[PDB]
Write a protein that binds this ligand. Sequence first.
Ligand code: CLA
Ligand code: CLA
Ligand code: CLA
Ligand SMILES: CC1=C(/C=C/C(C)=C/C=C/C(C)=C/C=C/C=C(C)/C=C/C=C(C)/C=C/C2=C(C)CCCC2(C)C)C(C)(C)CCC1
Ligand SMILES: CC1=C(/C=C/C(C)=C/C=C/C(C)=C\C=C\C=C(C)\C=C\C=C(C)\C=C\C2=C(C)CCCC2(C)C)C(C)(C)CCC1
Ligand SMILES: CC1=C(C/C=C(\C)CCC[C@H](C)CCC[C@H](C)CCCC(C)C)C(=O)c2ccccc2C1=O
Ligand code: SF4
Ligand code: SF4
Lengths: 137, 73, 161, 143, 741, 80, 65
Amino acid sequence: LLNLQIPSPTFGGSTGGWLRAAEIEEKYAITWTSKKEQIFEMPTSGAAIMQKGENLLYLAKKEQCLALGTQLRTLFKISDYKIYRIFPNSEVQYLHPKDGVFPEKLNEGRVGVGNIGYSIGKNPNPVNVKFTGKNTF
Amino acid sequence: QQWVLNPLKVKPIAHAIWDPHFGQSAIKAFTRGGVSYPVNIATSGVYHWWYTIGMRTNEDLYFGALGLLILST
Amino acid sequence: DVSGLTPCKDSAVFKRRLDGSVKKLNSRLANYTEGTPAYIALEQQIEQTKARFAKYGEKGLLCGADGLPHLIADGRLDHAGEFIIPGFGFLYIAGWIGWAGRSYLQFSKKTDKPNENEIIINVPVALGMMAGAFIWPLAAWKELIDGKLLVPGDEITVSPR
Amino acid sequence: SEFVKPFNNDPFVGNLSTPVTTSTATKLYLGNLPIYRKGLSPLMRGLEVGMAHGYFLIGPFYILGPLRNSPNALLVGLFSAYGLIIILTLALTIYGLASFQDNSTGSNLESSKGWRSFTSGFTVGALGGASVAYVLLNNVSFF
Amino acid sequence: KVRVIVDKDPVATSFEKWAQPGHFSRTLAKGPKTTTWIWNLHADAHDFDSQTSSLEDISRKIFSAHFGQLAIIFLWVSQAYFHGARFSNYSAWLQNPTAIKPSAQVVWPIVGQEILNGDVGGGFSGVQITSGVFQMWRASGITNETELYWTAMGGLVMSALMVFAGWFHYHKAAPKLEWFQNVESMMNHHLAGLLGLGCLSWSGHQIHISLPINKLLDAGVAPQEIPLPHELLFNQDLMAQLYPSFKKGLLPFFTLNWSEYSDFLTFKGGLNPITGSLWLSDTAHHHLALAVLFIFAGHMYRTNWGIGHSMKEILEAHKGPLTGEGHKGLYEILTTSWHAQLAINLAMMGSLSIIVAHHMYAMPPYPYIGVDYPTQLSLFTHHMWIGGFCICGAAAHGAIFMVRDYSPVQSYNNLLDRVLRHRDAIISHLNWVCIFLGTHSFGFYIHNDTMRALGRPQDMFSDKAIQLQPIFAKWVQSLHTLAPGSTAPNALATSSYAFGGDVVAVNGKIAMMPITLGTADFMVHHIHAFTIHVTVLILLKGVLFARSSRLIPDKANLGFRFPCDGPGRGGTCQVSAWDHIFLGLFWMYNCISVVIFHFSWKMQSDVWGTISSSGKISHVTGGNFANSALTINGWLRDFLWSQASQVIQSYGSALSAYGLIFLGAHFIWAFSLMFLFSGRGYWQELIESIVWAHNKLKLAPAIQPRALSITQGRAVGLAHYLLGGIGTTWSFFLARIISVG
Amino acid sequence: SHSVRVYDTCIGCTQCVRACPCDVLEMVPWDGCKAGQIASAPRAEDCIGCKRCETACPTDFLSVRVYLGSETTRSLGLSY
Amino acid sequence: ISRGSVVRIMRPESYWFQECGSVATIAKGGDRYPVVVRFEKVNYAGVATNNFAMDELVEVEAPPA
Ligand code: CLA
Ligand code: CLA
Ligand code: CLA
Ligand SMILES: CC1=C(/C=C/C(C)=C/C=C/C(C)=C/C=C/C=C(C)/C=C/C=C(C)/C=C/C2=C(C)CCCC2(C)C)C(C)(C)CCC1
Ligand SMILES: CC1=C(/C=C/C(C)=C/C=C/C(C)=C\C=C\C=C(C)\C=C\C=C(C)\C=C\C2=C(C)CCCC2(C)C)C(C)(C)CCC1
Ligand SMILES: CC1=C(C/C=C(\C)CCC[C@H](C)CCC[C@H](C)CCCC(C)C)C(=O)c2ccccc2C1=O
Ligand code: SF4
Ligand code: SF4
């Protein structure tokens, strides 16, 4: 799944990193490849240097990982980023490019989840679903 | 009972004050209404209401309080 | 006479107020010498105060116990000038303004660029609408009768009920 | 010559290895304080913390209390310290009840039995320290 | 090489883009579709960095905008001088300054507002002024109105020249970015050329025109018999009759016998007993010494010749073990970004305005300004408010720089990067400081109120129950009082009489008096510290978390000012650095309001007043600050309620305008709370109902009406709040001080 | 967690997925739209509720809609 | 209804409900909402066009000739 021995970017440390919850609930990792060693901005405050070749970074939020991925995509054109969720049991769950391509590109292997068959303003009224466990959507 | 005799001069008392933060000056100032202890001057008209409906002594008020307690029970 | 008030002509408190104002200015007058700009200006002030009080007395205003004019607005024509005549004057002017605005909007929409016509006013025709709005009560009645004042009801958006 | 580096060689942990955080003086003082000292049982940790806090808790009440200018100033200060210590150990007990709900290990501050022992030590130590401070302030003429 | 290079005719002079309103912005150039377009026009009017992408064009626009601002300032100086010349009693005041109230505004008689032309003395009716311009002109040596008229005309000519220069330097000959980025030459010219020669010329003016005229006026010569400045300038015989050292000429200057000029170049210190203000000889010596200092300073930085420093190397050489690369990259940052320069300059300008306020009251520089109590209060309060506003502008533009012009490539591991990397520690420690300071400082007041209400004055934090004395402030005051003998031997008197010494008084009124510090001063100073610390907390958090935060990792992408990032994460309301500035403006308002209240009460109770022949000192409020400033009840009763009498009782008098402005400022402050508390969704739905009502009559506009944006609603609420508060205090202070003093 | 829904007024503009900062949304094939794709939310548990999808949606009313509900660590976006 | 025509919207949830709009395109085959009605009155988002179904539109003025 994940090597856990990839060299990480050169960074001098910061106080925006994980604090006692990533090591007990869940951490996140993001791994990418860079053609040149170069300076980028961490989602946490600070400037790091991504190394030549493979790079691995740790974070506390899927939002932080996605923000870094967007930064890499629209500044350095690195689209080989892949994101994992690491549990305290060391289980690793590969998350963001789940089908191997980004969500924007269409793939035939994706099944519709949360798709409604009518327009937005045709939901039942709250009085209809009163005293029932369902909701108006 | 004192207020009943002279309603227009005696100031009605709501309840006594118990406060270990009060100074001697505070105790002296809040001692009022013809009593020997600090008190609060009622501003709810309950004295006037009870006097009008026909309460004349503290015993009647106490028995009304007991009846209301039994009703709450 | 209405509501216990009396005219300001025979109002002792009104006369006392007039004398008090006059005495206050004449006192302030002591600082300045004769013939100076400030002295003549204060003389104008005293004359205007006396003229205002005389005019208020002559106009028939009712003065209360406080010695100030009280306006009666109920419909009586004895005191029409207080509210009824100014009321009709304002109604005419306000309808003039509203009619000029409405007619200019009707023009500006028909234009090729209504959005720019609203922030850059076509003054040559706007002045025309301001002038033509003088006859708004007849124009409004005519448009109402012709069904052009009101937009029908189901041609105007309305939110989901 | 860098003097601020990553905490435990981990740039992505939210901390820095500053002189204040990591220096030998800080490590020595913290690790030798009772709450972090090695080999001390939870009772001993609580006892040391208790006497340390109860010794100084009397002073504010004694000097700046309402009855500072009264013959019973020190007695009132000691009673105030006792009340504050009662509140503190009640806070400790409810904290243990809320945090260490299910536990069977013991001999560890993060367990129910260990925290109960720590609270007991704190209570006894604080009462003793307040009493000792009362005795010292009564016999202040010695010093 | 430092050289002049410009582009000839870079822009055409035409009204086509006057007609096209939103020409500057790409989005607004299309045209209006909603009323938000109108607001966005004004919001983005002067955002040149967003309008374009060329630093050269931005710099040219800024330069010519500065020329326009200078034109406006010159017109303002012209209005002051001209109104003094034409619509003022300056001649009467010059003849009799203590008795005559300065006034330079007259209202026309239209609706009975002529009552505002109150009795100011000298056979003149007008509105009393409190700007100190009369004392300024007396110090400058103006004794007649022709001089005021001619300097007003000169100011008008200068304003026209500034408008012409602004047109010329954008439309005819605009400089280049290479010209703009010559910071070393700019600093050399502003130190040696602007400040140095400005001080030198003012010192010359003083030595030649102000010392003789003021000395004769203090002696007793009426303004009509004063020799004219053109006579005094070259008549060395008269200057020798007045100051004997002038007969020696400039040889004692060229040879280093500078002591010969001791008569008109003094170090007396203190205040002149006649005018109750600083010695003008001391002021002339001061400005001359500063001219020398600035001309010396301005030869530091490198230019076309070899000699000189370079700020790049100076910064790059300053780096330490705990700072990594140190100040590397800051020269590039401050040469490329205008917002960083604006931030630093605004911070210094605001702090300098506050310093000006603190110094002018303590050392009255202009003659008869100390006894003019309205002038002192007005100038102090005005400059304090301007200082607070400038400091918050500094924070805002620092945040703007962080959002827009920041880049890690240039700041890898420099001080900016290192500060961002522990912003959490910085803000948490300042948070603890704020809580501790506020708790203790305000809990002193609350404890005092509780004890007074409980009838326990012996348990108070008072000067006689539990003293909190400012030992360090008292020690510093003692040192400054002993300074003229020991540590400043050539100074005859103290720098200020506030520290100690005699009670300077002119006629009956007291110009200056020692200010004693006690428990109340301790409490109010710690309140000042708490307020400053919380304002710094808000502003510094806004600047540091401008890029991102633990809540929004990509806050920089959204922009500088944006409403929110949705109701996710529990709610991300006011996460923007703009919203941090919006919150910090309330806090500087609170800070400056408390500071001016402290100043007003302390000076009316303990300095201002009258002194009798026997030596009895009677103050305006009677020294009630020391005992009533210990409780919030005392602040509410003995300062607000007590001194609001002169405002509320002003109707039917000259101060009726102040009463009306008092009520109107209260109204505006209350009106602001609508915008501050309400939200856009309600108003948009209400506007939908009103739009239906208009559509029913076929007059709904093509430019569809919309509720104001969220940022705009916050801005409108803040602006109305600040206007109402500042206007309330303005009317209250002016009415109170004009009535009592 | 919040409930993300997509109604058949979608026009496959794929801008909601671009605005998405948590990879909650993805395009899946569809018949109704001419672009042959529709937004779908297979990872609603990662939703935080900033409604950037709703902001970016160009339909007259939102084809993609987010209903806030039960809060969690992920939904609150707490780094601690 | 038809290209170039003016049609009144009847979708209850639309910003332009019970307002006229110019039809710009009708898609054939799929396209559950095939008509593409363009307006001159921008909604809150700022878009001035939207797709609609056949039954959601009411014919009020046929295209020119
Ligand atoms: C925050 C401001 C403040 C301060 C300084 C004080 C101070 C005082 N109040 Mg209080 N008081 C306050 C707010 C404050 N009050 C407020 C808001 C109210 C209204 C409710 C009151 C109401 C009130 C009453 C009704 C009474 C007092 C009284 C007192 C006195 C004794 C209180 C006591 O026993 O404290 C006990 C305090 C402690 C046990 C601990 C204090 C904290 C310690 C010293 C901090 C040490 C930190 C340390 C340096 C950290 C690092 C250490 C490390 C390096 C090793 C004292 C003068 C009483 C009196 O007689 O007054 C003269 C009294 O009757 N106060
Ligand atoms: C040297 C001074 C200076 C300069 C050059 C700038 C320049 C700029 N600021 Mg500003 N700023 C300053 C001081 C300065 N600021 C100060 C002191 C503050 C603190 C309050 C701020 C706070 C601030 C913020 C928070 C923001 C800016 C922004 C901007 C930019 C756009 C401004 C614009 O277009 O406004 C055009 C002019 C207006 C919109 C009119 C404003 C009217 C004000 C609010 C009310 C005036 C009231 C009046 C005096 C009294 C009314 C009386 C009543 C009785 C009628 C621009 C780069 C904005 C930006 O995006 O920057 C990149 C931005 O968001 N500034
Ligand atoms: C009177 C109104 C009021 C009050 C009480 C506060 C209180 C506070 N604001 Mg402010 N604030 C106000 C109006 C007010 N604000 C307004 C109108 C705005 C909108 C512009 C803001 C906007 C605002 C912001 C944006 C921020 C603050 C901050 C703070 C905190 C400052 C730190 C401090 O000194 O805490 C200590 C508490 C006080 C000073 C309150 C009174 C304390 C007394 C003496 C009692 C303390 C002793 C004890 C613990 C409690 C008493 C006994 C009790 C158990 C009965 C504090 C909680 C800052 C913050 O959080 O910094 C950490 C901050 O960032 N405020
Ligand atoms: C580090 C440091 C510091 C600090 C210090 C401190 C913090 C101190 C404290 C101190 C203290 C705070 C002390 C205490 C002590 C105590 C004691 C000495 C106690 C004792 C006790 C006892 C002896 C008891 C007894 C008992 C018991 C146990 C129980 C029962 C009863 C009895 C009584 C028997 C400073 C800042 C200076 C700076 C430098 C460094
Ligand atoms: C006589 C009198 C009186 C009475 C009064 C009354 C009773 C009234 C009523 C009234 C009413 C009950 C009314 C109603 C109305 C309704 C409606 C429905 C309306 C409509 C309107 C419109 C629609 C308009 C339009 C326009 C125009 C025409 C012009 C301008 C523009 C515009 C568009 C706005 C009193 C006692 C006070 C006293 C004084 C006198
Ligand atoms: C009152 C209020 C409104 C309503 C205000 C609106 C719709 C804008 C009002 C601006 C007016 C039109 C400015 C000019 C007022 C003049 C008196 C109108 C006469 C001149 C005309 C020719 C325009 C908001 O929209 C709002 C939005 C967000 C937070 C708070 C609030 C808020 O508090
Ligand atoms: S009210 Fe405004 S700032 Fe607050 S959650 Fe809603 S959109 Fe965000
Ligand atoms: S309408 Fe919304 S959900 Fe549909 S394609 Fe466009 S952005 Fe995506």
